[PDB]
């Protein structure tokens, strides 16, 4: 519930998208996919996670529409 999955960005933009999501809380940890267009972000609180979730469908960096959903990777 502190964890979210941010997706929809190319590998070249990953670190740009992380700094954008770092705005919404002091991220503890993030895990990047090998192939995929996604990362799992652990915030400090539900409230921070909720601010990240509210950005689902929003455009970042003029041209990257971003998905955000509750993290379901148990494993992580």
């Amino acid at each position, epitope marked *: 519930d502190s964890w979210v999955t941010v997706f929809g960005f190319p590998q070249a933009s990953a670190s740009y998208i*992380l700094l*954008q999501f770092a*705005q*919404y809380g002091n991220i503890l940890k993030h895990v990047m996919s090998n192939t995929g267009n996604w990362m799992h972000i652990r915030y400090q609180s539900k409230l921070q996670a909720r601010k990240a979730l509210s950005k689902d469908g929003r455009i970042f960096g003029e041209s990257i529409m971003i998905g955000v959903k509750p993290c379901i990777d148990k494993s992580v």
Partner: nanobody
Amino acid sequence: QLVESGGGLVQAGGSLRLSCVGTGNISSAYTMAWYRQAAGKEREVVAGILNGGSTHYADSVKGRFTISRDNAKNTVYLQMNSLQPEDTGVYCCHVVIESTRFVYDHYWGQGTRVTV
């Protein structure tokens, strides 16, 4: 751990260099970034060294602010110029470090107050 300094009162128009020093080595950082939050406002990234060493700046600070680092001193810097009252807020430094493949730990300073 990260400890920021260099904050305080400048007058509108002036220059100021913020510092953040790491207790452990930060030379392999994935990213380094400075954030600010003015009272009753959302936090915003002001300057970032992206992975590979490209930079991102908030539109409001483009051409006025520079993010740099000294590997030897284990320090990150934010050079600020032509400071405006809107630059007022708590600034904090952010360092991300890969532990195991695809797993990244995040480090945050306590913040430093800037008042223009």
